[PDB]
């Protein structure tokens, strides 16, 4: 428990960043990806 442990929040941050970048390449837009990225909390709410 002491040395290392809680590294999940950083990996979730990296996950969403890389997904946004990959979406940006797919659509060739910095803005359009947000239309997909805004759906994430609509899924997480159900799990919780």
């Amino acid at each position: 428990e002491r040395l290392s442990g809680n590294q999940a929040p950083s990996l979730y941050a990296i996950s969403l960043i890389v997904v946004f970048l990959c979406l940006a390449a797919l659509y060739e837009s910095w803005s359009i990806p947000f239309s997909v990225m805004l759906v994430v909390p609509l899924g997480v709410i159900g799990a919780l």
Binding site: I14, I17, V18, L21, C22, A24, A25, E28, S29, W30
Partner: protein, 49 residues
């Protein structure tokens, strides 16, 4: 490939940014030293009479 990314400049940026991000995260975990293991390994047998 050049003509592909000439029309797709955001794609070109994405590839570069992902490479840079991967590199940034690597620097945090990468160990630091003067040299790597350049010295050949040794084994010593110690006995007493």
């Amino acid at each position: 490939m050049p003509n592909f990314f000439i029309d797709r400049p955001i794609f070109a940026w994405v590839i570069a940014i992902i490479i840079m991000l991967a590199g940034g995260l690597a620097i945090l975990k990468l160990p630091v030293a003067q040299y790597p293991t350049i010295a050949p390994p040794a084994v010593t047998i110690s006995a007493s009479y």
